[PDB]
Every structure is written in structure tokens, then in C-alpha cells.
């Protein structure tokens, strides 16, 4: 039909992915949808393996991929990732984050998942 | 003074609905549907109560004729063997039931020999 709720558009999807990866960088773990949780884990692993240099170049590049949240904004998440998250898990080839399956949702029985940061 | 008539109406409607209980589908649980099915069943029963007479009569004819075709004749010839000699009132139903009996129809079919 014509004009209605937009829903999960490509721009909205990428903005939501950025918000979720910023949230998992700030709060550490995120309880979300499994399909979103896996994409968030992928982006978090990419960010961890990208931030091991800790230079302004990665700052500018990741500036296009983080969306500020309640606790951390873009340039504070920059320092957070460049300081503690990325170097803590660089000791291993991959596996910078782990996604585990949870139960359904109350009202809509949506299969959820939890994403945590670990080596 | 009002005559309710509901009691008679309820009794008759319940009777019509219940008499058709026993068939597949919702035919057990209706009045118009149940009555149409009862009409069909009554038509079949009325046609049958006259037709099954000849139906099982011809069943006897066919059952006898099979044995006669195994006896060396046919039913037309067997009544030709009931016309030229030894006309018996032992009936086509009863000569058929004699086959269920041990060596009873054989005596009849050997008696009708010309």
C-alpha cells in the first residue's frame, strides 16, 4: 500500500546495527535478536581487529560506524575500544565475541540471543 | 388464553433431529439437513422394499445358473430341463440354499436330467 510505518528499511537497518554495536561496546553484553546479535558480533570483531593500531585513521573510519548511546558517545567509545576492548582480545585469532541462544519473547515469541565480549 | 404449543414443537423437533443421529457429518446435528437425509434414506428404503425382491430373486437365478454352467447346462436350458421333464416346485431361492446344504442341490440337478 501507500505511506505507512516504514519498518526495517536499509538505512534504518544499518543505523540500528550501528546502535547495537555501540551498545555492546558500552554495556559489554546485549540481549537482542539472534540475527541482529550475530551481525553485532561480526561488527564488534571487525572493530576489535581494526582498533589494535590506535591511530586517528581508525578513529575517522569507525566514526562512520558508531552511533552515540546513553552511556558512551562516538569519540568516548573510540577511546574505550582503542584502550581496553580491542587489546584485551587481540591475543587470539578471532572469536572476539560470543553469541548464545535464549528463549522466546512474551508477546511475540521472538527467538532472542545474548552477545558477550570474550577472548 | 394462549396455547403455548412449544412443548409439542420441542418434542417433535427433538424427535426429528434425533432420528437422523447415526450418520457421518453434521447430518446428526441439524433439522433441515437431518430431514433431507431422512427423506433420502426413506426414498431408498421405499424403493428397496420393492426392488430387493427382484434383486435377490435374480441373485438366486445367477447363483443357480453358475452351478448349471458347471453342471453341463445353463439356466435357460435348466428351465428347459424343468419344462420337458420333472417340473419341481423346489424353488430357485431354495435350490440355491440347497447348495449351502451338503449334497442337496446335486440331487435336485440330477433329478431334472432329461
Amino acid at each position: 500500500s501507500y505511506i505507512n510505518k516504514p519498518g526495517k528499511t536499509s538505512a534504518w537497518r544499518v543505523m540500528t546495527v550501528r546502535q547495537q554495536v555501540s551498545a555492546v561496546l558500552a554495556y559489554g553484553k546485549i540481549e537482542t535478536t539472534l540475527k541482529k546479535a550475530k551481525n553485532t558480533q561480526k561488527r564488534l570483531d571487525k572493530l576489535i581487529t581494526l582498533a589494535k593500531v590506535d591511530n586517528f585513521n581508525n578513529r575517522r573510519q569507525v566514526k562512520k560506524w558508531l552511533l552515540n548511546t546513553n552511556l558512551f558517545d562516538v569519540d568516548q567509545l573510540m577511546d574505550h575500544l582503542f584502550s581496553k576492548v580491542a587489546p584485551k582480545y587481540e591475543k587470539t585469532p578471532g572469536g572476539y565475541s560470543r553469541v548464545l541462544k535464549l528463549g522466546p519473547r512474551r508477546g511475540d515469541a521472538t527467538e532472542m540471543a545474548i552477545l558477550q565480549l570474550t577472548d | 388464553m394462549r396455547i403455548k404449543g412449544g412443548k409439542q414443537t420441542r418434542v417433535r423437533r427433538k424427535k426429528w433431529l434425533k432420528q437422523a443421529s447415526g450418520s457421518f457429518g453434521t447430518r446428526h446435528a441439524s433439522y433441515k439437513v437431518a430431514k433431507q437425509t431422512v427423506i433420502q434414506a426413506a426414498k431408498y428404503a421405499y424403493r428397496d422394499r420393492r426392488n430387493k425382491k427382484r434383486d435377490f430373486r435374480s441373485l438366486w437365478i445367477l447363483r443357480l445358473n453358475a452351478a448349471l454352467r458347471e453342471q453341463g447346462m445353463t439356466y435357460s436350458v435348466f428351465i428347459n430341463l424343468l419344462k420337458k421333464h420333472n417340473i419341481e416346485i423346489n424353488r430357485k431361492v431354495l435350490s440355491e440354499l440347497a447348495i449351502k446344504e451338503p449334497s442337496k442341490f446335486n440331487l435336485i440337478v440330477q433329478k431334472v436330467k432329461s
Binding site: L100, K101, L102, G103, I114, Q116 | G25, T26
Partner: protein
């Protein structure tokens, strides 16, 4: 389109005989006793004993 004749109540029941879900999996948790689902977390907060969830 639309139906001409109604699908029977028994026809409806026979049609709805396969709307139910498929069978599920079962998993024994070694530390906290529960018969959970496969590659899922139990009510005790652990996927296969990895403490990855709270008590609730």
C-alpha cells in the same frame, strides 16, 4: 476467491491436524539440573554450564 460450499467442521479439524509445531530437542545440564533445549540456555542461567545469564 471465496468458497462456494462450506468446509465441514470435521473437514476443518482434519485440515487443522498439521498446524501444530514439530517436535523439540532435549538437553541435560550437568551442573544445574534441568531438561533444557539444545543450544539454548536453561532457567538456571547457563548454556551447557557457561554462566551466561542471570537467575531469572
Amino acid at each position: 476467491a471465496v468458497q462456494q460450499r462450506r468446509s465441514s467442521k470435521h473437514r476443518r479439524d482434519k485440515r487443522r491436524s498439521h498446524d501444530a509445531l514439530t517436535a523439540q530437542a532435549l538437553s541435560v545440564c550437568q551442573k544445574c539440573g534441568k531438561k533444557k533445549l539444545f543450544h539454548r540456555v536453561c532457567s538456571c542461567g547457563m548454556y551447557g554450564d557457561l554462566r551466561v545469564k542471570k537467575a531469572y
